[PDB]
Amino acid sequence: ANLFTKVGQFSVENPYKILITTVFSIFVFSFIIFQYATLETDPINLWVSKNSEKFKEKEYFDDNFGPFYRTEQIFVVNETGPVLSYETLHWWFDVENFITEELQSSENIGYQDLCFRPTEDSTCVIESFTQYFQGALPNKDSWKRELQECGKFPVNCLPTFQQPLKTNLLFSDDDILNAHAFVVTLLLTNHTQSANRWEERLEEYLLDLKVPEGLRISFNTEISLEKELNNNNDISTVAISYLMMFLYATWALRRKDGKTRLLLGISGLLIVLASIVCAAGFLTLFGLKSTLIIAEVIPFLILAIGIDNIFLITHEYDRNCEQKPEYSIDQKIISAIGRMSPSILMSLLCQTGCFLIAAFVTMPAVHNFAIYSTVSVIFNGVLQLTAYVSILSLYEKRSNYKQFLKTFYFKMLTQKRLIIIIFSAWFFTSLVFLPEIQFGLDQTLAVPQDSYLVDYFKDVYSFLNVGPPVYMVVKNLDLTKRQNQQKICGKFTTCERDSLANVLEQERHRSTITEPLANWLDDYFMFLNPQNDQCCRLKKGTDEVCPPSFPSRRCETCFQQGSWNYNMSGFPEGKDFMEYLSIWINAPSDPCPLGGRAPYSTALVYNETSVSASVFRTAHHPLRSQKDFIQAYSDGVRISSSFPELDMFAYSPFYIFFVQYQTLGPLTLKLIGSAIILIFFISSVFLQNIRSSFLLALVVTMIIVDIGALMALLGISLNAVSLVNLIICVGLGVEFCVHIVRSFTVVPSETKKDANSRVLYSLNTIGESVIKGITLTKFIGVCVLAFAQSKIFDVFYFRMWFTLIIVAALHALLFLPALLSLF
Ligand SMILES: CC(C)CCC[C@@H](C)[C@H]1CC[C@H]2[C@@H]3CC=C4C[C@@H](OC(=O)CCC(=O)O)CC[C@]4(C)[C@H]3CC[C@]12C
Ligand SMILES: *[C@@H]1O[C@H](CO)[C@@H](O[C@@H]2O[C@H](CO)[C@@H](O)[C@H](O)[C@H]2NC(C)=O)[C@H](O)[C@H]1NC(C)=O
Ligand SMILES: *[C@@H]1O[C@H](CO)[C@@H](O)[C@H](O)[C@H]1NC(C)=O
Ligand SMILES: *[C@@H]1O[C@H](CO)[C@@H](O)[C@H](O)[C@H]1NC(C)=O
Ligand SMILES: *[C@@H]1O[C@H](CO)[C@@H](O)[C@H](O)[C@H]1NC(C)=O
Structure with missing residues (x-):
């Protein structure tokens, strides 16, 4: 607890060496990212644990019976009616034959060089209704009758590769003439890069294909998911978020008189940028790979939480200006750091611990995100205690300056018992909805909403009449x-x-x-x-x-x-x-x-x-x-x-991607349960009051339980991403309540020791900081996640974290004061 005061004290006396080292540290880390940074894109490397039993079983299957076919599935759809007509048959017969016979990939590698062949002397296996006619366009008149009998008796129309094709594989309805879609599946036994090149050529071919009027096609190549999953451009979104924070930071950090301090606002955001860069460049040295989560979430999450302590220290230092005016600028910053360090350090440790608990989830992309967040939070905390303290001392010395509200805190404390009944009922109602949380992570959300895979995934659920x-x-x-x-x-x-x-x-x-x-x-x-x-x-x-x-x-x-x-x-x-x-x-x-x-x-x-x-x-x-x-x-x-x-x-083939759900529920109870008990011990060590620590942990449990019930009501499924986000919500909720609980626990001897007085003094000291420095700043950081290109970052990050802010703020500002005055 005293190292922050010692660290901050060292920073005010040596601001330039701290600032020179910071930029040198940032420069070297940014250089490492520039040179050695690698992005993990493979879905298996992102979602499948290498140590899972299913993964090992996949390795044995691949080694002994070859890797499963590389599948390229195409859906041709007639949304408002049946898709089969001679116009569509004539079109698809030409297109289908070109893909499998004439679509060279550069390197002059076509489908024939990569297709699955049951025997060395057989033809390419094409799972399509065009193979009922051996890839030859049927007659203008008899194609309807011939196609029906072939669907009824696949053996009578065996394809050239001698494997009968059932209608449940080639169509959406067993009534072929009325099926709204027909399916075309291409199987490749080649697993070298030549297959990847051809699939890219195939994917480019279908995106440029002119579908007939009234029809629509969705498709998926073996490279489609990797290409579409890691295909995003959100540079402007990050800038927009950091500009809004800059505008808010300028307003929030202006002096009590009303004078803006632009350097403090800019420095606070630069420190957040350095924390992300320093963490990313630090983890590169360890060989850790970043993923889409790091690029799409980390800047927003660290922005949401990496700016909080700037307001807490600066607002406290501002308080040190009116109070104890004889103190110097150096002493004011050190004194402000000293009294706010225990709450800052405890919240920081809770943030660090919750991320480490969230790192027990075995999904590498989610585990990578938790590890990245852990390093960023630690880097952010160190920078705030050294870099900002150096800047604050430099700025304030150079720019010498001479210097609802409380009404709500009394009206709401009149309804203490009513408040507890409202929140107690809310918690009990929430417990009823916890069993109603659904498991899974819809794949349509994982890809960009504008991706062509969104249509394909809908077609599979809608039209695919066979299972894996x-x-x-x-x-x-x-x-x-x-x-x-x-x-x-x-x-x-x-x-x-x-x-x-x-x-x-x-x-x-x-x-x-x-x-x-x-x-x-x-x-x-x-x-x-x-x-x-x-x-x-x-x-x-x-x-x-x-x-x-x-x-x-x-x-x-x-x-x-x-x-x-x-x-x-x-x-x-x-x-x-x-x-x-x-x-x-x-x-x-x-x-x-x-x-x-x-x-x-x-x-x-x-x-x-x-x-x-x-x-x-x-x-x-x-x-x-x-x-x-x-x-x-x-x-x-x-x-x-x-x-x-x-x-x-x-x-x-899909088993590797659903390993988590077999034990997700028990893991959720264990990890969230472990997080809450960790809060109790960390809080007890710092608060030194088990009663206050228990109530803090109790209130955090209600926030998490309420969030879990709201997940069921808000349609947020439980998966590896949601579980870690919910584990982070545990740490985020603590920051909402830690300062209120600690201020209640520790009060100056001048104020009365009555419980009601302690809650009031707490709300009259940091209630504004909780609003300005925790609540509002959190919302700005994650608000733009609602507009992310991939809906996962909105459904599973914004909706959960936006709900956390509202639920945590309500518990911290209404229930917690009532839960502290009583009990
Ligand atoms: C880095 C962040 C954005 C997390 C990335 C996680 C993805 C790699 C995961 C999340 C959900 C997964 C999907 C969940 C369900 C399915 C269906 C299943 O596919 C099939 O059985 C084939 C037919 C069909 O698509 O239904 C297995 C693959 C897939 C697309 C999974 C592929 C890998 C996905 C997209
Ligand atoms: C995957 O396809 C490639 C062709 O793109 C196959 O590689 C060819 O193999 C033959 C015979 O060894 C060589 O003469 C060619 O020069 C190779 N071409 C290329 C581009 O490498 C490869 O054999 C296929 N994979 C399997 C398992 O058969
Ligand atoms: C055949 O395979 C079995 C099992 O791997 C092994 O024990 C045996 O020695 C093998 N025999 C020959 C002749 O390869
Ligand atoms: C799509 O369905 C409508 C509904 O009957 C049909 O009129 C139209 O012809 C279909 N599209 C094609 C290309 O046949
Ligand atoms: C199997 O069937 C044959 C004749 O169908 C019969 O002779 C034989 O005893 C049977 N096997 C056994 C174990 O009873």
């Missing part, structure tokens, strides 16, 4: 043994009642994973059925695969009519299992439909003696909300635990 695929990865299961393979199959009478196939079939009518499971092990055993005389043919008298050109009577089935049984009697085991597995996983699907090459060539990781890992593919039903995604993620985790005897997990 789910892969059941089973590893280290010795499938050469009958017992182990009985734990997977579901087509045979000896398979366990709780086998992978059996259990998952039950979940189809009980969970979000409602699609049939592609069981390769069942297909492999079905492929061995002697009834399938065209499957598993061996040269007679030899254990060699029958050549496809070989005619009948020159080969024999791997199994005789009496060996294969539906109770798995005679099924291959040991080395025989792997012997015929090579035959099955290489057989084409043309003569034998049960051949596992096309469907399961990449579904198995194996060698000549064992299958080390394998994949069983299913999918969720269409997920059309944050609740659906959270429930879908919950189902995957729950089902993975349904097989304690299997080293297995469920993989979906």
Whole structure:
């Protein structure tokens, strides 16, 4: 507590060395940012913890079964009716073929060089209704009848890549002629930069595409999210915020006579700028990467809170001018610093601690923001206690100067009991609404409102009639043994009642994973059925695969009519299992439909003696909300635990982005609870009065509880961003109440020690400072976040922090005086 007085005392005696060091420190840090600063843009690096189980499972899936396809999805929409017409078919057939056959990317790399191919000799997989006709424009008359039958019976119109396409994948309505949209999905197995270049060319192509009148297209490339997420220009917004603060600072920092002090106003804002630069340049040396949050929020948050102590010290120093006039300018600043240091330091520590508590959230972008805010707040506090004190001493010495309201503080203290009843009811009403807070972070808010991804995300929720695929990865299961393979199959009478196939079939009518499971092990055993005389043919008298050109009577089935049984009697085991597995996983699907090459060539990781890992593919039903995604993620985790005897997990591409919600609620209670107890201990050490510290913590709890209830009423979902913002609201609320509580606790001997008198003296001392130096300054800092290009910075930052200011100010200015006079 005395180091601030010692630090401020050193600053007044050595202002130029402090000021020279400050600019030198700023210059070097700004140089580091200029040179070594890096911006993190990858969504996975921003939202996914590298140490999460889902991330590690994604690494295993990528290494063993390749990274999931790079998906480029296009929606073509007829908002007021059906989209299918020969005019639109003629247009899209030309556009669709150009994209996949003629759209070179520079480097002369097209779709054919990057597309997914089920087999090396197959064609590109294009998930579109144009593939029902093999990418050839149908007749002007028969396209309606042909398209309907193809939707009804996909097998009858198999595409050139031999994978049937269901209408729920290609359209918005199973009634194809009435569907308002049709979906086009492009899959790329290439994961090098050449794929990135082509997707950029594809993205530029679609933005410049002339859609027919009455139609509309939304799309998404694998690079779209990264490009759109980190595509913002808010330089003017920051300047506007700092100009409004400059105008307010000039008015607030003018002398009691009414004379403006421009240097003090400018210096206070320059110190805020230095705090951001010094923190950003400091964290660069540690290799920390900034993100969109740093560019879009940090200048506003630090501006909102980095200017408060300037008013508190200057206003207190102004008070030291009228009171104790014989004191010199140096002594006035030191005395003002000394008495206001305990409240400033305690609030600073609460700000520091809450940010560090918010750093326990594992989202790197959110964790990065908390760490950046922690350094900025510490840098801001040091600068205010050294740089501003040096400037204030320099300015005041050079410019020598000779020098509602209280009525409300009495009228409101007449309604102490009524005030407590109003706020007590508000807190109790708020508790009822806490269970009503919704989880999630809508993706439309994350991207700029003008982005083309906003339309695409709406189209997915509106028109996509399929859900993300789910892969059941089973590893280290010795499938050469009958017992182990009985734990997977579901087509045979000896398979366990709780086998992978059996259990998952039950979940189809009980969970979000409602699609049939592609069981390769069942297909492999079905492929061995002697009834399938065209499957598993061996040269007679030899254990060699029958050549496809070989005619009948020159080969024999791997199994005789009496060996294969539906109770798995005679099924291959040991080395025989792997012997015929090579035959099955290489057989084409043309003569034998049960051949596992096309469907399961990449579904198995194996060698000549064992299958080390394998994949069983299913999918969720269409997920059309944050609740659906959270429930879908919950189902995957729950089902993975349904097989304690299997080293297995469920993989979906979106799982990494919804890890937090599995434990968000318990984490919110733990982190916010930890923050409030931290307030109690920090307050107790400084206030040295557990009663006052308890009431301060109690009031902060009511503010946070009320904010949480208002989040439910205001439609602010709970996620990593909201949780950290709400954790910051804990620190922000403390600053609203710390000075009121401390002034009540410590009063001069001249004033009466009565509780009512102490509350009045507190309101007649810093009540103005709380309004001018905390409340109004906070609003100006974050007000422009309401107009941010991305609605996340308005929904989850402005709305929460704007609500914090109102709720905290009401509790600090009305309830807290009543809660102090009584109790
Ligand atoms: C630096 C600040 C601005 C935070 C950045 C966080 C984003 C990288 C996160 C927040 C919400 C996330 C989204 C939440 C939900 C989804 C849906 C889900 O997508 C699918 O299942 C595919 C089909 C569909 O889009 O519905 C997974 C990706 C996505 C877009 C997520 C992508 C990553 C996002 C945009
Ligand atoms: C991703 O696509 C690139 C092409 O853009 C492939 O790289 C080519 O590979 C061939 C054969 O090795 C070379 O002759 C070309 O010079 C490469 N071109 C470029 C631009 O690098 C790459 O193989 C693809 N990725 C995978 C996994 O197949
Ligand atoms: C879009 O829907 C309206 C509603 O019937 C329809 O009249 C119009 O033709 C559609 N657009 C196209 C390009 O067909
Ligand atoms: C499996 O079925 C065959 C005939 O269908 C029968 O001979 C055999 O005993 C059955 N297996 C077992 C373990 O009973
Ligand atoms: C096959 O893979 C298994 C599991 O990884 C391993 O234990 C075994 O040594 C491998 N055998 C050969 C011949 O590669």
